Design an enzyme around this catalytic site. Structure first.
Site, PDB file in Angstrom:
ATOM      1  N   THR B   1      -3.516   3.961   5.118  1.00 36.89           N
ATOM      2  CA  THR B   1      -2.764   4.236   3.894  1.00 36.89           C
ATOM      3  C   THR B   1      -3.333   3.229   2.983  1.00 36.89           C
ATOM      4  O   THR B   1      -4.291   3.504   2.243  1.00 36.89           O
ATOM      5  CB  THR B   1      -1.271   4.038   4.065  1.00 36.89           C
ATOM      6  OG1 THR B   1      -0.650   4.903   5.049  1.00 36.89           O
ATOM      7  CG2 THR B   1      -0.573   4.342   2.728  1.00 36.89           C
ATOM      8  N   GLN B   2      -2.779   1.977   3.078  1.00 37.43           N
ATOM      9  CA  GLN B   2      -3.175   0.851   2.298  1.00 37.43           C
ATOM     10  C   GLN B   2      -2.759   0.996   0.846  1.00 37.43           C
ATOM     11  O   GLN B   2      -2.725   2.066   0.185  1.00 37.43           O
ATOM     12  CB  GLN B   2      -4.753   0.533   2.552  1.00 37.43           C
ATOM     13  CG  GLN B   2      -5.317  -0.743   1.894  1.00 37.43           C
ATOM     14  CD  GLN B   2      -4.565  -1.965   2.366  1.00 37.43           C
ATOM     15  OE1 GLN B   2      -3.833  -1.970   3.337  1.00 37.43           O
ATOM     16  NE2 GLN B   2      -4.928  -3.155   1.792  1.00 37.43           N
ATOM     17  N   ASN B 108      -7.523   5.521   4.091  1.00 41.08           N
ATOM     18  CA  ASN B 108      -7.242   4.133   4.203  1.00 41.08           C
ATOM     19  C   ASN B 108      -8.467   3.496   3.635  1.00 41.08           C
ATOM     20  O   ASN B 108      -9.308   3.226   4.524  1.00 41.08           O
ATOM     21  CB  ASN B 108      -6.908   3.737   5.730  1.00 41.08           C
ATOM     22  CG  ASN B 108      -6.681   2.215   5.820  1.00 41.08           C
ATOM     23  OD1 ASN B 108      -5.656   1.658   5.390  1.00 41.08           O
ATOM     24  ND2 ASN B 108      -7.660   1.481   6.409  1.00 41.08           N
TER      25      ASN B 108
END
Lengths: 121, 232
Positions: B1-2, B108
């Site tokens: 995700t980040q 990500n």
């Protein structure tokens, strides 16, 4: 009939109810003298206390309506207090909504307008 | 995700007639809290290129690894396969670009915003921008982070086009990065007074002036008004 018992106009066009108000402010027998200096305004007023059993310090007629604006009252002290309360409330309000304290001119005009309304009713 | 975890400020930079200057402040903040000072965000790759990395500090370290691996690959094999196949800024730029782009697709990404500033071996000035999204564009003046749309306005008034590069010198740019840094320290809550500055010259090489403080500061107008408006 009621042209002297309430604030309606008479055939003379003169409001007798209103005249009676000025015939009650001189019956307290307090004189005032107010002079404009070059940097100040000074007002001195009578404070006749003829009793041992009235505290003279609390007998007063100079009420501070703003921190900068004094008010000296000639005439009955119930009506004095009511007019002082109303004036203080308005002066505070002026600071709140206009961002500066109420001028002397406009504070005078505001009580003047309320007086007319009280003789309209 | 980040998403943002611990995040740096802004890298700012501009061209002149013989090279480019590039500078950044030393901050890894954990948002409002300025939790790390002294964390350098310029990373030199060889002596002809400084890469200024903004965004997340975590990813920065992990590109620190990739720039260092890169110098190793180039050195590999012949010792003459790195003297006249030596690194150009344009190589570093492209490599960094394509990893970011394809990492965004795995969802990500490397959360960074990057300036690759250098000079080619033909002497051309090189200032070009890449980011996590993979958008590529060149500008005579470039910055990243908050300073991409704050600090950058000032800078672009010195140089607006390719014609105004010969009208700018190493000592004009010098004053304007010092000034764009003072603007940055003033009007950004994420900032460090410390800043390091590198200069890539084609004539004199990498000159790396570290750990300057903001000077010529003014606070003499703060005595004259108090209150929030209404209070006098």
């Amino acid at each position: 009939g009621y042209d002297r018992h309430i604030t309606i106009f008479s055939p003379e066009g003169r409001l007798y109810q209103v005249e009676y108000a000025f015939k009650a402010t001189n019956q307290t027998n307090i004189n005032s003298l107010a002079v404009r200096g070059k940097d100040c305004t000074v007002v001195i007023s009578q404070k006749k206390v003829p009793d041992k059993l009235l505290d003279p310090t609390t007998v007063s007629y100079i009420f501070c309506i703003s921190r900068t604006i004094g008010m000296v009252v000639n005439g009955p002290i119930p009506d004095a207090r009511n007019a002082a309360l109303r004036a203080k409330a308005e002066a505070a309000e002026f600071r709140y909504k206009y961002g500066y304290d109420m001028p002397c001119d406009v504070l005078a005009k505001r009580m003047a307008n309320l007086s007319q309304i009280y003789t309209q009713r | 995700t980040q998403q943002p975890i611990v995040t740096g400020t802004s890298v700012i930079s501009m061209k002149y007639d013989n090279g480019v200057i590039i500078a950044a402040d030393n901050l890894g903040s954990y948002g409002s809290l300025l939790r790390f000072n002294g964390v350098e965000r310029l990373i030199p790759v060889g002596d002809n290129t400084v890469v200024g990395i903004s965004g997340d500090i975590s990813d920065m370290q992990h590109i620190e690894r990739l720039l260092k691996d890169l110098v190793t690959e180039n050195a590999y094999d012949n010792p003459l396969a790195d003297a006249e196949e030596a690194l150009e800024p344009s190589y570093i730029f492209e490599y960094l670009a394509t990893v970011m782009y394809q990492r965004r697709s795995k969802m990500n990404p490397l959360w960074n915003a990057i300036i690759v500033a250098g000079v080619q071996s033909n002497g051309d000035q090189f200032l070009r921008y890449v980011n996590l999204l993979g958008v590529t564009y060149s500008s005579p003046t470039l910055a990243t982070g908050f300073g991409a749309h704050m600090a950058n306005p000032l800078l672009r008034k010195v140089v607006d086009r390719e014609s105004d590069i010969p009208k700018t010198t190493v000592q004009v740019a010098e004053e304007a990065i010092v000034n764009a840094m003072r603007v940055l320290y003033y009007r950004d809550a994420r900032s460090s007074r410390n800043f390091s500055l590198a200069i890539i010259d084609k004539n004199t090489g990498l000159t790396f002036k570290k750990n300057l403080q903001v000077e010529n500061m003014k606070w003499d107008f703060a005595k004259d008004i108090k209150g929030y408006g209404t209070q006098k």
